[PDB]
């Protein structure tokens, strides 16, 4: 992976047997996603971003295929604009800043 | 820099003769930043995210010195908790996504 910024970082990733398109934000310290169903128990959580307070379905230990890179985390899914991968799995598939 | 993201990826910026944080952003398109002011004329915008909108004033030809480099260009100021680096001046002092 090389990724220039003149355009957004947006990627493919594997879900459930589903293909979504996500985008690679590294000031997001988590990963949120549109309203979706998925296996299992989940906790209740809120989350505060720049302009209010959002509320999300916490799943933990769910397997994610980012770009031929796989891996296994919690997953909020919520009313986000877009599908945002955050700092907690981008840290899993080896992820950098450089300059 | 090497950048790694165990934790939020935080810089150094001077702008006017002001020192401040800010975070390096791949997930914003634009340049947002703490109540300020600044030399010139600017018009209002609505921006939004996480949570919703907030009011925003834009300049022009701004320049910024982010860890040691040189940009120019438009920042947005208004209430954020944070200042965020966008693309918009992350592309101008190199920075690359790496994978
Ligand atoms: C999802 C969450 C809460 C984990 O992180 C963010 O929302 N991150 C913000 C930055 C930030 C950092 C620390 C505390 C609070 C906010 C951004 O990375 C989110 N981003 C880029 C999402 C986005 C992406 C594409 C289009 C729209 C929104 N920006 C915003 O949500 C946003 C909102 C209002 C104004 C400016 C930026």
Redesign the pocket.
Same mark, same amino acid.
Not at 25 to 32: E, F, K, M
Not at 47 to 51: A, D, R, V
């Given at each position: 992976p090389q990724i220039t910024l003149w355009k957004?970082p947006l990627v493919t990733i594997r879900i459930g047997g589903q293909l979504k398109e996500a985008?690679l *934000?590294?000031?997001? *310290? *988590?990963? +949120?996603l549109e309203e979706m169903n998925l296996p299992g128990k989940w906790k209740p959580k809120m &989350?505060?971003? #720049?302009?209010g307070f #959002?509320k999300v379905r916490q799943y933990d230990q769910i397997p994610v295929e980012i770009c031929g890179h796989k891996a296994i985390g919690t997953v909020?899914v919520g009313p986000?604009? +877009?599908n &945002?991968i955050?700092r907690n799995l981008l840290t899993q598939i080896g992820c950098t800043l450089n300059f």
């Open positions: 957004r985008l *934000d590294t000031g997001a *310290d *988590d990963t +949120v &989350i505060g971003g #720049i302009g #959002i909020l986000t604009p +877009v &945002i955050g």
